[PDB]
């Protein structure tokens, strides 16, 4: 019980496909490109996360002021509640002061 | 990424193999055998 009786299908991986063979290309677009572009501009994803890093409270605060006016009502309400909970935890709870 | 213990079967069998010759439920039930295997050692 809790462990499969047969072996799973083999995990075949192509180490020489397009995405793996061309990974890391254009990471030095600035050094070798006269600094016309910055490597952070090659990052794709959420517009509030491009070239930026923070903790959950910092991520949640940043998302609310950048796309908060476009969010669904239920998702926005939960975001505000998450910011309230995190504000209390980080600023009032912990081992160190 | 969600990780789960996949080899919990082997972790408890290395305890129950020392309890096979015990009497009662403490020879097949980990909860009971672990406390009697530790006393045996």
């Amino acid at each position: 019980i809790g462990i499969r009786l047969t072996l799973p299908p083999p995990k075949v991986v192509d180490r020489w496909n397009e995405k793996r063979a061309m990974f890391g290309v254009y990471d030095n677009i600035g050094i070798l490109g006269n600094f016309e572009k910055h490597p952070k501009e090659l990052i794709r994803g959420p517009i509030w996360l491009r070239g930026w890093k923070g903790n959950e409270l910092q991520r949640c605060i940043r998302k609310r002021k950048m796309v908060g006016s476009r969010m669904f009502a239920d998702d926005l309400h939960n975001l505000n509640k998450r910011i309230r909970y995190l504000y209390k935890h980080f600023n009032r709870h912990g081992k160190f002061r | 990424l969600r990780n789960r213990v996949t080899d919990r079967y082997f972790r408890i069998q290395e305890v129950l193999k020392h309890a096979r010759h015990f009497r009662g439920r403490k020879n097949r039930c980990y909860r009971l055998a672990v406390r009697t295997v530790i006393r045996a050692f």
Binding site: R4, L5 | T6, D7, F10
Partner: peptide, 26 residues
């Protein structure tokens, strides 16, 4: 179903040993 291969492979080896004991070869 849990993902992984090491535990399933290791469990097949114990099954083989158990099978050999129950039915030892000539």
């Amino acid at each position: 179903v849990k993902k992984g291969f090491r535990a399933a492979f290791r469990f097949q080896k114990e099954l083989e040993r158990q099978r050999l004991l129950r039915c030892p070869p000539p």
